[PDB]
Design an enzyme around this catalytic site. Structure first.
Site, PDB file in Angstrom:
ATOM      1  N   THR A   1       0.866  -1.216   0.000  1.00 24.47           N
ATOM      2  CA  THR A   1       0.000   0.000   0.000  1.00 24.47           C
ATOM      3  C   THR A   1       0.887   1.245   0.000  1.00 24.47           C
ATOM      4  OG1 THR A   1      -1.911  -0.990   1.101  1.00 24.47           O
ATOM      5  CG2 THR A   1      -1.671   1.391   1.319  1.00 24.47           C
ATOM      6  N   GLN A   2       0.734   2.084  -1.022  1.00 27.26           N
ATOM      7  CA  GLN A   2       1.440   3.379  -1.142  1.00 27.26           C
ATOM      8  C   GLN A   2       0.388   4.485  -1.208  1.00 27.26           C
ATOM      9  OE1 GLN A   2       3.616   3.220  -4.852  1.00 27.26           O
ATOM     10  NE2 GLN A   2       4.041   1.037  -4.475  1.00 27.26           N
TER      11      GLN A   2
ATOM     12  N   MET B   1      -0.605  -6.634  -2.885  1.00 25.25           N
ATOM     13  CA  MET B   1      -1.095  -5.435  -2.142  1.00 25.25           C
ATOM     14  C   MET B   1       0.000  -4.360  -2.125  1.00 25.25           C
ATOM     15  SD  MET B   1      -4.213  -5.739  -1.229  1.00 25.25           S
ATOM     16  CE  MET B   1      -4.419  -4.501   0.052  1.00 25.25           C
TER      17      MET B   1
END
Ligand SMILES: *C(=O)[C@H]1NC[C@@](C)(O)[C@](O)([C@H](CC2CCCCC2)NC(=O)[C@H](Cc2ccc(OC)cc2)NC(=O)[C@H](COCc2ccccc2)NC(=O)CN2CCN(C(=O)OC(C)(C)C)CC2)O[C@@H]1C
Ligand SMILES: [Mg+2]
Lengths: 235, 195, 222, 231, 233, 240, 244, 211
Positions: free
Chosen positions: E1-2, E107
């Site tokens: 996740t970014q 993810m």
């Protein structure tokens, strides 16, 4: 001493070729394939008359449509049977169908050559895998520790095999009934067996499309033995 | 699960455990035995999270049975309790802890003494004259504090238990469908067949 | 925070005749209120007389169809070029889907073909590999609009024999390929009118013992 | 002699005996022929039976719709290598939507066979392979050998008495190279080649295995009644 | 996740009779700050493929490195690297699609929307889209970000279905693209005036035009707008 | 870890490490099992160049695996302890998952499977042990006696012996055991078991051990006194 | 590769013997004699030091006799360093048992686990076995006073009187001759010393070549005391039994 | 709604045939009984995928048991394979309410309740699913040990019909099974569409409904 995965100068694997010697010392196993079913018969060879012969399990069910007879170091066969059973049930779980007899054999033979420096040595046991599938009907397969498998109309393995195979070569034709094939296995076993063939020291089995793989109890086999002597005496 | 009691009298330990198994607004079963025999003279009652209770009891039972066969000898109740505590003390810092409370009722043949051990799912062990897990204790501890005597017979022990079950059937909000009662003495483990 | 899923819309529909089966899908691909494409096929010939659609999150659908097509290719290799029966395909797809039970493929899957008796077969799956054989089923955005119409016109549900006083049911009978295509074309024009994610084009794959034929029809582009 | 105990030992003359003994298993193997025009590539393999009651060992294996090989030597080693090639053909498809070039298939087999010839406790592959394919640059024939040496050819043969067919193809070169857009004629020139490697036996109907790939021809194997046409 | 940090806005593209056109502005935004003003977001791969990238620029620079490494690996043991075994647009796309879908499945997405434009060796126009979710689709017109909302409606008036492609010249198609870039400059607050445009033609090959400017802007009507309703002066 | 294939084939097709493991069994103290009509008896020689032995605490040669199954052995004592531990663990594991004690065939098949595994695993030598496994399946009254050997083969025996001079006591059992009529009682069966060991043993002093297993987990070890009576009765029935 | 240099420490001889176990026992047969004698009221451990030099620190040394817990001690015959590895293992194993059950480990259980470790080195891992034999002297509330031995084979057995190391054949003959069951600990002390006195390869048995330990009930009512004798305490016992 | 009960004449097993996706009716014609072998039945309630996958898997494990032991698995052993499996997944979010019903000679007719919490209970009567309480109400108030096979089959059918009516998340059809010493016998599909009206008329019940 020298590596377990070594090639001979002749271009053969030492450990495989030596395992083949161990199989020749094994008790006899014969299979015959017909349009009415495949017959599997074995020599039990009890080492002593105190040993309860019915505890000698050398013909073994893999699935309802696939049976298996063994000759050689028969303890080595346990994990091969376990893999074969798992592979047949697993296939049925993934595809809601019966595994093909060839595909089951190819799965067993994929174990064979995964030894070295995986298990420490090849298997010291050959298998006759007999079964039925819709695609290629009744089938008999010889599964060796080389990881090779052949299809046979008939085949003998173990000590009496050179003599038994020459006998099968003449006797087999493409319109053998199941009955004829049962008598033929009994006949060829009594010839190469050291001791005298009876329902206690030899065991019969067949697989039919209709009733699957069945091991014959000693009552039924004793009648086929009595039947066999009557045909022979009367020529 | 919910109700498990234990009273240690003169010459026995008495374990009483509720028969009800409930999921949602349904009593699935009204004859549940919340107990495993660990050894001939040691009984464990259990209550807590569904599934965990039986899985834990049976795991402990297997380990004590193995020890018995290996050493051809029965572990003292003190030893079995310490083993069980350590297992729970391990579980509490696991990925998913065993959420099980236990009473261990045993007769130590060497000391000729009955012993009751109360152990919670954190691995908190105490030796007690009488014990309970869950809401039961809020009624039974004060009741036993008054009525319990150290030198009582097994018959007096069962009457003291009737008092406890009567009180819980009066004041507890939930229907726990009565108790199965088991006595642990010098002659082993037996169950009272009507209560 | 990153959301690994999306909704690409579109709707799919499978019906089983006596000796045929259809898998129909609209060719529209959407995200939110935008049209990505007016012609992005989502019904595929997978070989061995099996057609497949995985409608919902397009990425997960393409991943699944790819994995099944690959599954068929390896079945041939590992089992001496044997034909993958529709029932065996169905069970295989259950395992594909149930493999990602805790990070699912967000798709409604339908496969169509002929069973081992040459009869029309339709199987349908939930996202995590639940499945059942049925005479007809709709999936995706307009499933809720089309399905009750199929119950009525394919399985003759709630229809009774005129003048029997609601005691004799309309008798279940197999439809012609001509009739099934009428129901599909009307199911989709109705779905297009009332659902915003359905439109642009309709593509039908028909499966008979002679193979897979394709039919295409313009739908309203609004 | 003293230097043949493993694959990780050089002889004083700079030979690897375990690799040379591996190469020996191929020599003992039943003959197989490969040859190609500009439009098609054909494999012809003589299948060997255990006795009169046995099936004839499969020699030809399909790797993709556009690629396949014939084997001579240890059959299980061919199964491992062909399985590896099926995976590389697959990977090329799924990741790049690209049919694997026969040249790259060659290089990948070479590097896989090589690892086994330089590390302790392993063993060289005991099998030789002829790879035919039709990729973006036309028809190809490859000769694989367990030393790791892969070779692109117009035609060749490997196994028992292979030298006969290999000399005939060397003679026929200019004839068969131009059997363009004729399947049956390339097959019969393949059948003629294998016939130079026969002794005290000729081609029967369950004896003979033929495979073809070409411009508008998937890799397909002809066996039994469908090769009677060619004897 | 970014979360994306430095971002590029719309990539727009369409098919015409012979080839494909693709365009994108030269801005790297940092939220509302128009931080970097010389950023190339069209990366040519061989002489038959342009990859146009929007979204996170750090992830774009990663994808550049993947592509220049791909051309290298393809040349290895490949005598036909510049001939029949050259990288096709379809090969390059399928690779990027595979990566995009693997990274979303871990993810850990590449925070980008990608359009692969090019012509195949058999002269067929290639135009396909992939984004951070691994979602893929083809159409005669494709666009990312605001592009999808404002560019597509204008480009679809030129090529509405497949049958319109043979009827569209490179003059007409390039005109539609340049006009659509002016609209985006009017209406997208994360856009810039300076852009690059690339034509991949099955006859003239790859034409790459840098330092284009939006021109012929209508602003004159602004002087007649006073207040927000009742104000007269 | 250590990898060497210690168990490998020789040119004659023998596995010398399995065959040499059988030599260790040959050199082990004798052990015999005889199954009656309604019981099984396990009898073990105890080598007699040792006094100052503390037999209160010295490992008994017959081991309970579960309360209904017993295992005796000939060969390396140290090796035997490892098989017994695994068998005991598997016995409790079967109870936990199948909710039923192991059948004698199952327990044998497991121990046999362990011995076999050690014949084709890198870095290990085979077990220098053969086992007699005897008992009663749960809720079954038919007596069970099985033999295992280092190779992993196993089989069922009406009566059998293993260890030093087993050939001598097998000789005796072969002509003294009627298949058609097993020893009809515990009394009879114990006598035939002690008689068989007296061909080979010496004085039946601190030299013979007997365990009797009856149905429903009824196992009792005999003591000097009880054994000694069978010994004195056998010897005074000898004077012919 | 490396196969060429592998002794194969875990294989059978054609006679079904473990080479490395046999050679380890041969090694132990040259080690200082250790004697265990078990009486009705305690156990004696006596061991002879590998010939001392006049300059070795006598009191602060522990070659032969080691404490496993408060209830169990071992006499060592063999490689001291090998023994110390196994002793630290046995000490931990005893403490794991106390931690788990809140009861001192039963003597046999400890012995069996140490014997099982030794066994492992003879069946897998291709390492050399431990060149060590132990005499275990201990007490538990189940079997009371117990003597065991273990050897490199991982085999263990229980004894009333036993010897390990040098001249065991000689020592076992003298013990077998003079041991009685009724014997008290003070008589067992005398027997242990008289036995070493005769079997020793030295001219005379002196205090500075002896390690001596008793496990009695000789404190306060049904609780067990371990005594590792100081130089002076041995020297006194040597005079009182009349060997000096 | 699924149910199984023990009586004089063996075991009755009755299930509805509805699959739901929230308030959407996914199917009216779904199989909730798995025939593991000729003497072993499994009922399915909860997650559709979870039930179908793990109960057909259970059938594979039961087949392997009879291959390695040459004997059919005991109801106890078959239930404990499934309960030990779901217990390994505890907290992962599996949803399964199952009954393992069957006959073996050593056990007699046996019913085990197994759920995804890891609960495993032997018992004579169980109702599982959204509509269990509805099924219990009818079943518990009409159940005797001495029901005739014919009466017990009807009570099972009537108890699922009851649940099908009141429970919004049960319906479609009733699937009936009878388990004896000779194994399971299928007693047919019964659509609630026709069964409700026939039962109303013939029984005179369901006076809550506009007749
Ligand atoms: C009697 O009491 C009766 N009640 C009725 C009913 C419907 O409740 C049921 O339990 C049935 C029985 C099954 C029918 C199929 C044969 C096997 C038994 N159960 C269902 O129909 C379930 C209901 C259900 C139960 C529990 C759930 O917990 C999550 C969810 C749903 N139906 C499904 O599971 C449903 C089936 O397909 C629906 C569908 C169809 C087409 C498109 C979409 C959906 N599918 C789902 O629930 C799918 N869902 C996927 C995601 N998921 C999930 O967990 O995802 C994550 C992200 C959280 C990981 C869960 C499932 O029968 C009893 C006996
Ligand atoms: Mg619309």
């Amino acid at each position: 001493d020298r590596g377990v995965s070594t090639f001979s100068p002749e271009g053969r694997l030492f450990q495989v070729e030596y395992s083949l010697e161990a199989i020749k010392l094994g008790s006899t196993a014969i299979g015959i394939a017909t349009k009415e079913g495949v017959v599997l018969g074995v020599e039990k060879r009890a080492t002593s008359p105190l040993l309860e012969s019915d505890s000698i399990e050398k013909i073994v069910e893999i699935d309802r449509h696939i049976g298996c007879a063994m000759s050689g170091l028969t303890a080595d066969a346990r994990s091969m049977i376990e893999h074969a059973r798992t592979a047949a049930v697993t296939h049925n779980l993934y595809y809601d169908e019966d595994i093909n007899v060839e595909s089951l054999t190819q799965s067993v033979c994929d174990l064979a050559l995964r030894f070295g420096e995986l298990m420490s040595r090849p298997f010291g046991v050959a298998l006759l895998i007999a079964g039925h599938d819709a695609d290629d009907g009744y089938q008999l397969f010889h599964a060796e520790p080389s990881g090779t498998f052949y299809r046979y109309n008939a085949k003998a393995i173990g000590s009496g095999s050179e003599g038994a195979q020459a006998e099968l070569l003449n006797e087999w034709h493409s319109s053998l009934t199941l009955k004829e094939a049962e008598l033929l296995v009994l006949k060829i076993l009594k010839q190469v067996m050291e001791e005298k063939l009876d329902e206690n020291n030899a065991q019969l089995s067949c697989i039919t499309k209709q009733d699957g793989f069945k091991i014959y109890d000693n009552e039924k086999t004793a009648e086929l033995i009595k039947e066999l002597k009557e045909k022979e005496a009367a020529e | 699960m919910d109700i498990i009691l234990g009273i240690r009298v003169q010459d026995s330990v008495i374990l009483a455990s509720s028969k009800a198994v409930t999921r949602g607004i349904s009593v699935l079963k009204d004859s549940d035995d919340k107990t495993r025999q660990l050894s001939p003279h040691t009984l464990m009652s259990f209550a807590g999270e569904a599934g965990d209770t039986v899985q834990f009891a049976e795991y402990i039972q297997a380990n004590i049975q193995l020890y018995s066969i290996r050493e051809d000898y029965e572990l003292s109740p003190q030893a079995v309790s310490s083993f069980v505590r350590q297992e729970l003390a391990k579980s509490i810092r696991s990925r998913r802890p065993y959420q099980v409370n236990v009473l261990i009722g045993g007769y130590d043949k060497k000391k000729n003494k009955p012993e009751l051990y109360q152990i919670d799912y954190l691995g908190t062990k105490v030796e007690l004259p009488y014990g309970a897990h869950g809401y039961s204790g809020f009624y039974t501890f004060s009741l036993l504090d008054h009525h319990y005597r150290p030198d009582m017979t097994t018959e007096e022990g069962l009457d003291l238990l009737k008092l406890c079950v009567q009180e819980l059937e009066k004041r507890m909000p939930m229907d726990f469908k009565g108790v199965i009662v088991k006595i642990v003495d010098k002659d082993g483990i037996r169950q009272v067949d009507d209560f | 925070q990153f959301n690994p899923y999306g909704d690409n819309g579109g709707t799919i529909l499978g019906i089983a005749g006596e000796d045929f089966a259809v898998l129909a899908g609209d060719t529209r691909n959407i995200t939110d209120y935008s049209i990505n494409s007016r012609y992005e096929p989502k019904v595929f010939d997978c070989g061995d007389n099996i057609v497949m659609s995985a409608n919902g999150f397009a990425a997960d659908g393409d991943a699944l169809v790819k994995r099944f097509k690959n599954s068929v290719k390896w079945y041939h290799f590992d089992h001496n070029d044997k034909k993958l029966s529709i029932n065996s395909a169905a069970r295989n797809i259950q395992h594909l889907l149930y493999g990602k039970r805790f990070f699912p493929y967000y798709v409604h899957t339908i496969i169509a073909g002929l069973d081992e008796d040459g009869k029309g077969a339709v199987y349908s799956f939930d996202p995590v590999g639940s499945y059942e054989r049925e005479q007809c089923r709709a999936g995706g955005a307009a499933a809720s609009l089309i399905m009750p119409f199929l119950d009525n016109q394919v399985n003759f549900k709630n229809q009774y024999e005129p003048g029997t006083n609601g005691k004799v049911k309309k008798p279940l009978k197999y439809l012609s390929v001509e009739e099934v295509i009428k129901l599909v074309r009307d199911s989709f024009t109705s779905a297009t009118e009332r659902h915003i994610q359905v439109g642009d084009g309709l593509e039908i794959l028909i499966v008979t013992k002679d193979g897979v034929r394709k039919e295409f029809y313009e739908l309203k582009r609004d | 002699n003293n230097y043949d105990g493993d694959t990780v030992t050089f002889s004083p003359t700079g030979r690897l005996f375990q690799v040379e003994y591996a190469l020996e298993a191929i020599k003992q193997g039943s003959v197989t022929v490969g040859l190609r025009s500009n439009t098609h590539a054909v494999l012809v393999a003589l299948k060997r039976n255990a006795d009169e009651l046995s099936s004839y060992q499969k020699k030809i294996i399909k790797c993709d719709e556009h690629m396949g090989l014939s084997l001579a030597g240890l059959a299980p080693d061919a199964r491992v290598l062909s399985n590896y090639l099926r995976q590389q053909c697959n990977y090329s498809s799924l990741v790049f939507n690209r049919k694997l070039a026969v040249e790259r298939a060659g290089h990948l087999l070479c590097d896989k066979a090589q690892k086994n010839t330089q590390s302790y406790g392993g063993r060289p592959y005991g099998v030789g392979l002829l790879i035919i394919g039709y990729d973006k640059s036309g028809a190809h024939l490859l000769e694989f050998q367990p030393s790791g040496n892969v070779t692109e050819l117009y035609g060749t043969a490997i196994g028992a008495r292979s030298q006969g067919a290999k000399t005939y193809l060397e003679r026929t070169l200019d004839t068969f190279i131009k059997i363009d857009g004729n399947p049956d004629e390339l097959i019969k020139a393949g059948v003629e080649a294998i016939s130079q490697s026969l002794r005290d036996e000729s081609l029967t109907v369950d004896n003979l295995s033929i495979a073809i790939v070409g411009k508008d021809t998937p890799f397909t194997i002809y066996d039994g009644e469908a090769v009677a046409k060619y004897i | 996740t970014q979360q994306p940090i430095v971002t590029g806005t719309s990539v727009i593209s369409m098919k015409y009779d012979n080839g494909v056109i693709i365009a994108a502005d030269n801005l790297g935004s940092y939220g509302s700050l128009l931080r970097f003003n010389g950023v190339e977001r069209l990366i040519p791969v061989g002489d038959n493929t342009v990859v146009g990238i929007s979204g996170d620029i750090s992830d774009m620079q990663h994808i550049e490195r993947l592509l220049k490494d791909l051309v290298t690996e393809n040349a290895y043991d490949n005598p036909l690297a510049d001939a029949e075994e050259a990288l096709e647009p379809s090969y390059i796309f399928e690779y990027l699609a595979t990566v995009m879908y693997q990274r979303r499945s871990k993810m850990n997405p590449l925070w980008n929307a990608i359009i692969v434009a090019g012509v195949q060796s058999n002269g067929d126009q290639f135009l396909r889209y992939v984004n951070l979710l691994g979602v893929t689709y083809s159409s005669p017109t494709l666009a990312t970000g605001f592009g999808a909302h404002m560019a597509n409606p204008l480009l679809r008036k030129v090529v509405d279905r497949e049958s319109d492609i043979p009827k569209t010249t490179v003059q007409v198609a390039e005109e539609a693209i340049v006009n659509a870039m002016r609209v985006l400059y009017y209406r997208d607050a994360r856009s810039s005036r300076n852009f690059s445009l690339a034509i991949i033609d099955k006859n003239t090959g790859l034409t790459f035009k840098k330092n284009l400017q939006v021109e012929n802007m209508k602003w004159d009507f602004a002087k007649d707008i006073k207040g927000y309703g009742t104000q007269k002066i | 870890g250590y990898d060497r294939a210690l168990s490998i084939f020789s040119p004659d097709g023998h596995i010398f490490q399995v065959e040499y493991a059988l030599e260790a069994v040959k050199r082990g103290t004798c052990a015999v099992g005889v199954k009656g009509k309604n019981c099984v008896v396990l009898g073990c020689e105890r080598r007699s160049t040792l006094k100052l032995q503390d037999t209160r605490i010295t490992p008994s040669k017959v081991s309970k695996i579960d309360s209904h199954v017993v295992l005796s052995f000939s060969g390396l004592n140290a090796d035997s302890r490892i098989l017994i531990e695994k068998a005991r663990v598997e016995a409790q594991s079967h109870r936990l998952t199948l909710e039923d004690p192991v059948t004698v065939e199952y327990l044998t098949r497991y121990v046999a499977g362990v011995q076999q595994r050690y014949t084709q695993s890198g870095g290990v030598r085979p077990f220098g042990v053969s086992t007699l496994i005897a008992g009663f399946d749960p809720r079954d009254d038919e007596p069970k006696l099985y033999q295992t050997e280092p190779s992993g083969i196993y089989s069922s025996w009406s009566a059998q012996t293993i260890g030093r001079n087993s050939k001598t006591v097998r000789e005796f059992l072969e002509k003294n055991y009627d298949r058609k009529e097993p020893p009809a009682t515990v009394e009879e069966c114990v006598k035939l078991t002690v008689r068989s060991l007296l061909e080979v043993v010496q004085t039946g002093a601190k030299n013979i051990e007997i365990t009797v297993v009856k149905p429903d987990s009824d196992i009792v070890a005999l003591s000097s006194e009880e054994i000694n009576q069978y010994v004195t009765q056998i010897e005074q029935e000898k004077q012919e | 590769g490396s196969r060429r240099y592998d002794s194969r420490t875990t294989i059978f001889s054609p006679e079904g013997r473990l080479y490395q176990v046999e050679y380890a026992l041969e090694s132990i047969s040259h080690a200082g004699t250790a004697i265990g004698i078990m009486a009705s009221d305690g156990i004696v451990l006596a061991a002879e030091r590998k010939v001392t030099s006049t300059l070795l620190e006598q009191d602060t040394s522990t070659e032969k006799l080691y404490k496993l817990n408060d209830k169990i001690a071992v006499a060592v015959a063999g490689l001291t360093a090998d023994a110390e590895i196994l002793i630290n293992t046995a000490r931990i194993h005893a403490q794991n048992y106390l931690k788990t059950y809140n009861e001192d480990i039963p003597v046999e259980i400890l012995v069996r686990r140490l014997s099982d470790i030794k066994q492992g080195y003879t069946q897998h891992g291709g390492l050399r076995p431990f060149g060590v034999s132990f005499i275990y002297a201990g007490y538990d509330d189940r079997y009371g006073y117990q003597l065991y031995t273990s050897n490199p084979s991982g085999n263990y057995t229980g004894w009333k009187a036993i010897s390990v190391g040098a001249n065991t054949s000689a020592a076992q003959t003298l013990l077998q001759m003079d041991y009685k069951d009724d014997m008290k600990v003070d008589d067992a002390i005398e027997l242990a010393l008289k036995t070493l006195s005769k079997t020793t390869d030295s001219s005379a048995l002196t205090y500075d070549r002896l390690e001596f330990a008793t496990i009695r009930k000789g404190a306060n009512d049904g609780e067990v005391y371990q005594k590792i004798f100081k130089p002076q305490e041995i020297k006194d016992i040597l005079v009182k039994t009349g060997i000096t | 709604t699924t149910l199984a009960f023990r009586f004089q004449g063996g075991i009755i097993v009755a299930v509805d045939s509805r699959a739901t996706a929230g308030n959407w009716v996914a199917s009216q014609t779904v199989k909730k009984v798995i025939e593991i072998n000729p003497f072993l039945l499994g009922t399915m309630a909860g997650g559709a995928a979870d039930c179908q996958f793990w109960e057909t898997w259970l059938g594979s494990q039961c087949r392997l048991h009879e291959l390695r032991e040459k004997e059919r698995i005991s109801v106890a052993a078959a239930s404990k394979i499934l309960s030990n499996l779901v217990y390994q997944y505890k907290g992962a979010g599996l949803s399964m309410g199952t009954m393992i019903c069957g006959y073996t000679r050593k056990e007699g007719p046996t019913i085990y309740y197994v759920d995804s919490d890891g609960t495993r209970l032997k018992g004579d009567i169980f109702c599982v699913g959204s509509g269990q309480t509805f099924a219990y109400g009818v079943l518990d108030s009409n159940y005797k040990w001495d029901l005739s096979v014919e009466d017990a089959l009807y009570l099972g059918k009537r108890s699922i019909l009851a649940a099908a009516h009141r429970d919004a998340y049960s319906g479609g059809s009733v699937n009936l099974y009878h388990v004896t010493e000779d194994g399971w016998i299928y007693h047919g599909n019964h659509d609630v569409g026709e069964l409700f009206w026939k039962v109303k008329e013939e029984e005179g019940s369901f006076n809550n409904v506009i007749g």
